[PDB]
Each structure stands twice: as C-alpha cells, then as structure tokens.
Design a protein around this ligand. Sequence first.
Ligand SMILES: O=C(O)CNC(=O)C(=O)O
Ligand SMILES: [Mg+2]
Ligand code: NI
Ligand SMILES: [Zn+2]
Length: 331
Amino acid sequence: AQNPNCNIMIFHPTKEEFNDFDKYIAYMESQGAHRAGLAKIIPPKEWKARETYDNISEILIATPLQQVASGRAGVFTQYHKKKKAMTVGEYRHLANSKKYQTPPHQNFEDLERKYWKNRIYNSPIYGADISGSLFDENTKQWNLGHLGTIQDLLEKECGVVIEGVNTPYLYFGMWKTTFAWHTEDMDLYSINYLHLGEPKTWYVVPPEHGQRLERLARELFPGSSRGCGAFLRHKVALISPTVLKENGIPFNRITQEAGEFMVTFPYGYHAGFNHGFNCAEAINFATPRWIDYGKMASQCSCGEARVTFSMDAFVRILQPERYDLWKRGQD
Ligand SMILES: O=C(O)CNC(=O)C(=O)O
Ligand SMILES: [Mg+2]
Ligand code: NI
Ligand SMILES: [Zn+2]
C-alpha cells in the first residue's frame, strides 16, 4: 500500500504531465496521495494562471463576512456576520490596515503559534465564496474554470443525465481569516489555487480516520451534536493542532504559497487560516473513485448547511433514501 503513514505529498509535474488533469490526479493516487486527504501540486515553471494581477481591484465582494469566534483558543466556533459590500481594492486596504494586518513574526511556525494563541480575540473579514475565475481563458492547463464537470462525471460513470452546473469560487482573505473543519459537499474533491498574496496554512485528517475527528467533534461541541447528526457540514467548528494531538487524532499540516495548487480528496477533513491578504480560487470536482464516497456522504438535514442547486441531483441520484429528509432541510 502506497503512503501508509498518510503523509501529505508534494508533486512537481513537468509541462508535459500538466496537460491531462484527470490522468495526473489518477497518477497521484497511484502513489498514495489521497491517503493524506490533501496534496500540494507545484506547477511547471513555464506555466502561469494569467499574465498579471494588476487589474483585479474592481472585483466586488458583495457580502464580506466578519468571522466572530466563541469558545476557547483551541476549541471554538465562528459565526459569519454580513458586512457592507466592498471592492477588492477596498478589502486589500482594509487587510493591510493596522487593525487587521499580519503581525511581525519570525517564520511560519511562529505565525501559526500566534494564530492559535490569539485568533479568538479578533474578528477578521473574509471575502468568500464569490462566483468567478481569475484564470486567463488562454490558460489551457489546470484552468479551474475549464475542468470537466461533476455532472458529466456522474453521467459518464452511472449513465444518468442530471441538471446542474459546476463553477469556481474566489476567496479574498486576510490575516486570521479561517476555514472551519469540513469535508466537501457530497465528499467531493476540491482543488484550490492560491493566485496571489500571503500563504494559507492547512490542516487535514486522513480519510480513513475521519470518523475519529467526528467523534472528537461531538465531544467538544455537544449541543451542536445534539442539534444535527452532521454538524460539521455547518462549517463553523475549529479545533487546534494542540487539541487534536491531546486527543490522539491523526492529522497533518502544510503551508500553501502563492502559485501553488492544493487538492483535497474525498472525505478528507480540512481546516486552515490565511497569513495575510491573499486571493484563492477553488472548485469541486469528481473522479470515478469519488462515486462510492458520494453515496456514503453524511448529510445535514437540520437546515443549517443550506447549499447549491446542483447538490440536489447528487442527493437524489446517489442517496434516494435520504432525499426526502435532506430536501426538507433545504426548504
Ligand atoms: O480557501 C478557503 O478558505 C477554503 N477552501 C477550501 O476548503 C477548499 O479549497 O476546499
Ligand atoms: Mg477589477
Ligand atoms: Ni474545502
Ligand atoms: Zn445541520
């Protein structure tokens, strides 16, 4: 068995290996990458997502989210308070302000320490989940706006034609902006490209150990657990590496820098934070190996998790027994 310790693997494809996306994902899995739940892909040196980032300031962040924490430093939830619209240029200035900028630090490890010590005492503002793309239409390799769609994958594997579309999303982050512990909708893959700016630190639990994280989460967030049998779908809970280590949960960590891709694998729980002003782009995708994960994915039916139009068909076709109850949650 490849990668039996479930370490995060890092890949350096050549320009030739960068041509066929599906084939490279399957190669990485042949080497055991999926066992970690997360992989890094460093693009060939010849490749670029676009020519420059000089003209992005007029993109609108229609609903910036202020991420307000409750709990203790290592075990907290966050809620998203909606703020007034602002442009990317306005947001970048805000991120760079004395109130919100990254503190002086020695290295990524020191910054990670400061994040876990201090996150809860501040409420950073995140421009998340903005439909759109920063890939140039002429970029033919690993262009997250030109991937094969999940609907087309399900149709190719299962023969059923379904409605729905699959488009990317932009994320504009600042120091301390936080992504809570989650897997993807329907336990899909995700791919994330850090277009610009400061790094993003990731934490991940191997898929084969996801239920260990879930059991710890039900202990640590006991009212949320009683409210919903899949409350990590709410995407609000944080647990620090110190706490994970104290409770024996297997995980790994890695920092993504500008110009790098990360891939999350089916049922790989992940969480993380931004080091400073940055812009990422991400999208879900599927492969044949995903289908069985999609069929087994938990679902939130309490009404909190509220997701896209396109998840309907996935539930309806892969999880017909759950469909009724899940749809009640969506309506
Ligand atoms: O970058 C972020 O804030 C969150 N991204 C992801 O969870 C992802 O790409 O799967
Ligand atoms: Mg612009
Ligand atoms: Ni994710
Ligand atoms: Zn729920």
